[PDB]
Structures are given as C-alpha cells and as structure tokens.
Amino acid sequence: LDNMRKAGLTDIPKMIQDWLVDCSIEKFPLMAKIYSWSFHVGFRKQKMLDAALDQLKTEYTEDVDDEMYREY
Amino acid sequence: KTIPTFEPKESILKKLEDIKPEQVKKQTKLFRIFEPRQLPVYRANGEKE
Secondary structure, three states: OOOOOEEEOOOOOHHHHHHOOOOOOOOHHHHHHHHHHHHHOOOOOOOHHHHHHOOOOOOOOOOHHHHHOOOO | OOOOOOOOOOOOOOOOOOOOOOOOOOOOOOOOEEEEOOOOOOOOOEEOO
C-alpha cells in the first residue's frame, strides 16, 4: 500500500485501509471490485525484443543443492 | 549462456531377450611373472669374476 501511493493514486488505498479494520466478508465485494477494475486499463504490449530478452535472462548457479535434485 | 551440468546416477538395463553370453577366453601367451636376468657375479673375495 506504499507502492500504490508512490504511483499517484490515493483513493484506492483509503478504501483498503478502511476495510482492514473490518476484515469482513460483507464488504469484500468492494475489494473484489477494486481488483477487477485494475485489469480494464488495457493490455501491456511491448516490443518483441524486450519481452524475450527480459524473459530469457536468468541466473543459474552451480552451488545448488544436488542432494535435492537426485530426488526431484 | 552457462547451463549447469547435471549427471544423475543411472545404469543401462537390458531385458532378458538381449543379454550377450560370456565371450570365451583363450590365452595367447603364457602367464609369466618371473623372468631370467643377466647379473654380474662376485667371488668370495669381492672381486668381479
């Protein structure tokens, strides 16, 4: 709820912090409404190069527990 | 990039249909563990003969 305040929006975490003092299922249809309105901002389309090269970048390590892999 | 090598402990398993019979052993030379060698000899004085 501080990552949502640096992004500029201030009327959404006031709704959540007014629900955290309740923690009740009667007002949870409001919290499911906030989560569902988030996906209506549009798709996150980006370039084909920056979507692969940020996905196909990973850090492997030879110090992994090999005792757990021979059971896996 | 560097993929870490992972060799699991295994061995090959054959069915009973293809197990090769024991290839028979016949020897080519004799079993030798001793060999004659040329050595100098010294008499009772110590002088070389």
